[model samples]
Target: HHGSDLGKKLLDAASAGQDDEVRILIANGADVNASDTYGRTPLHAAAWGHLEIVDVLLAYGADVNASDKWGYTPLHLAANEGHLEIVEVLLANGADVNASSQRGQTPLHVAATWGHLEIVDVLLANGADVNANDRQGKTPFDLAIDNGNEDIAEVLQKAAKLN
Candidate 1:
């Protein structure tokens, strides 16, 4: 319960999509990466709001690759949410394009499976392993076709041809 009291407030602000309050908490030195009872971060809150808080916690030195109790890094959430702008910001700030969650699926795979065309393109351009397979032996390409993401599938196919 080190900073649980303040963390609780921060978590609340995040979930309610109160970007301004989150910024205030961070200004007051609240840990941006603080995980609550369920292990969700302020970034998770901002995830729903789509990049409202600029430098919310990372400017305070939050781990760019930090995960929740569920092992989901900020990158995973951003891609899954189809927040392409957030994904770019996280990547520019040193977020790992290849970080996996409990399922060992990278952001590239998630974006591809979810048919997030822009996010998939970002990961691929960032050097995400086109050939990288997950725990299920499913490559991003496999997922693109699996989920009927024809555009993304074609994108990966073109990237594969070049690689």
Candidate 2:
């Protein structure tokens, strides 16, 4: 089909973690950074758990910080999904660790809410704002406590104190 068609194919392939299909589609000129109506790019799709796909997309110059309609970056999705390696890869590729969603929740907020302790630690080391408050005025530390993520709460407690 046309370029848009190829772009959609690439999106589906990336979302499905079809590594070979992603490579082949990019080889045939699919837009590595193609975004859907919500502005979710291939990197966003792959950041959920597809390390190889993430690497390929980054190698092809995908936008590491492409934010969707709700301002959720790939880093947000990776942290929310508790995908530690993907989160690290995104950070290494220059993903915005403190990027806020439309509701003002950063990747740190998502990680803490979802109880991803390791992801929270990594984000903190990468300069995530431990004291950042969401639109609801909930900090990452608050989310950790509210979500019953005591381990994460302890970590955020330490980071917040340091801040």
Candidate 3:
């Protein structure tokens, strides 16, 4: 019997979006929810819109709402990175729309901060809070404006009916 370091191996495979390696490792007893040193699960990779690998992880029961050490859910990453399909997929599989990061920043906040207008729209449509505040007591719109992401700010403004 050999110790395959399945956890880290799984993380690497997932990070690389290697569907085959991920499947093989999980089949060989790797935990679907395994985390690396940063506490990032395979779901982290999937959130980045890695095709085949995301589906594979979800099909095998990877935690749809798993948070990293920073308390960021897959939805947060997907939204921030503007990966639309990944956002949809994660939500369909039960990822939380309102999941908050360690800083109390939600996916909406991340999306808005980066000027991910489409992502902000999707999150709003899917029930993300337009008025949710972060640890700094700033809403997504606030972050958007502060970050010079006026596009996202405008989108959030409309969603929240803010003038």
Candidate 4:
């Protein structure tokens, strides 16, 4: 209720994957979709870790496709964390395979940047576009090069050659 706003409490709860607290808040008329000044939602916070929390958010109709100020969907967060199981969970729950961040960077881009090779494979198998471009017109491959992640670059290069 101060200048701080009630969002901090909510964001913190989401960040910690507090399943019961989140559900109680929503059930009690707390805003489920509220974002901080930073434009990050509970979905984004939970997506980075707790799969159960993601499921809870989805059950409550949290926007799976909702992006933060940075244009990152819950799918992107799951991908960035290299949570393959969570990625599969999100995908099954209808997460956008090619969802982009603020820079138009897809989950594939995040996976590549982090050198999550197994995650890259899962995303690709699930129809992630290796050649998808970001806001600056940089593809996932370009992101690998731009970040100098040689390991991911090698994976992208080989994947591109095969297709």
Candidate 5:
């Protein structure tokens, strides 16, 4: 099979949560690290919520920290999507907790803005910078407050005091 075709199929399978197909595609010579036009890899596709596919891709040597056009990593997507298990899996596999996107928003920033309090806690535990400012100079705490995520803002506020 053509590697590029297999790679594209893998991306599709991963995105669609077809773990079996993802495995088959990888075994058929798909580039586990292949990226789309946006620089999003199969792992990035899976990171939105497909925990099993994420594991399979990582086992096949997908780059956990691969960033897209906006510098959004798998961790960033998982956090933004409020996939707590995926976030944990990504972190366990060495995803960067503080990976900054194009706007300098970290996974914590995304989690807070999206009102994912549990994800915020996990990110903080994994050493996410509570006070890390984005390109606009707004911290995760600031974003949490701005988004009206009281619980997330409270957590970030406590963490910020420690930083």
Candidate 6:
């Protein structure tokens, strides 16, 4: 609750997909990395496909890998939402590709769970662990199987073969 008012406004602007307003707030002293009670930052806000705002926050030095209290990073949200461009930007900004949340779910696991085949492919290409196990001992491949993401499962299977 430190930067509460300004931070809440920034979070609101971000969640509402108001890129320009997010920029305006940042320029007016909004904390780019300010976290809510859940530790979600503005970067997490733009994960819903607001690429420009994601870029804006990055330009202002937002932590690309900042995790919430649940250990969900901006990349986790972006990947789960299947925002490929945002994932790319986060990766370029040094987001940890293999970062696991509190449940030990990686971006790859989330993508597979949501049937985001392309996102899973991208994460794999970026060196994501195909065999990464979550708290329930579910790997991305396992999630793909359970979620009926056959294509993603095949991709993960192939990657596992090579490793």
Q: Which candidate should be chosen as best, given TM-score against the real structure?
A: 2
Best of the two (2, 3) by TM-score:
2
TM-score of each: 0.90, 0.96, 0.90, 0.81, 0.95, 0.94
lDDT (Cα, 0-100) at 33 in candidate 6: 90
lDDT of each: 0.78, 0.86, 0.80, 0.77, 0.85, 0.86
lDDT winner between 3 and 6, please give it: 6
TM-score-based ranking, best first? Answer: 2, 5, 6, 1, 3, 4
For candidate 2, write residues 63-93 as lDDT tens digits: 8788887999889888989888988888998
Instruction: State the weakest 10-residue window (summed lDDT) of model 5.
Output: 154-163
In candidate 5 the C-alpha lDDT for residue 8 amounts to 82
Error of 2 at 107 (Å): 0.5
Candidate 2, residue 29: lDDT: 78
- Note the residue pairs that clash in candidate 2: none
For model 6, residues 32-74, the per-residue Cα lDDT tens digits are: 9988788889898898889899999999998888888899899
* Cα lDDT of model 3 by residue, 1-163, tens digit: 2233787788888878787897798787788787666678888876775867787788889888888778998788888888888887888888888998789988888887787777777777888877777879899878989997776777677767853
lDDT by residue for model 5 (28-143), tens: 76899997798989888888777788888888888889988899998998898988898898999998999988899899888888888788889888888777779888888789
Model 1 residue 55 CA deviation (Å) reads: 2.5
Clashes of 4: 2
Question: Model 1, poorest ten-residue lDDT window?
Answer: 47-56
| TM match of model 5 to true structure | 0.95
Model 3: residues with Cα > 4 Å off, grouped in runs: 1-4
Q: Write the per-residue lDDT of candidate 4 for residues 54-113, one digit (tens) a residue.
A: 777777777778887678887887788878887887888888888866578888888877
**Which model, 5 or 6, shows the larger TM-score?**
5
Ten-residue region with minimum lDDT total, candidate 2: 154-163
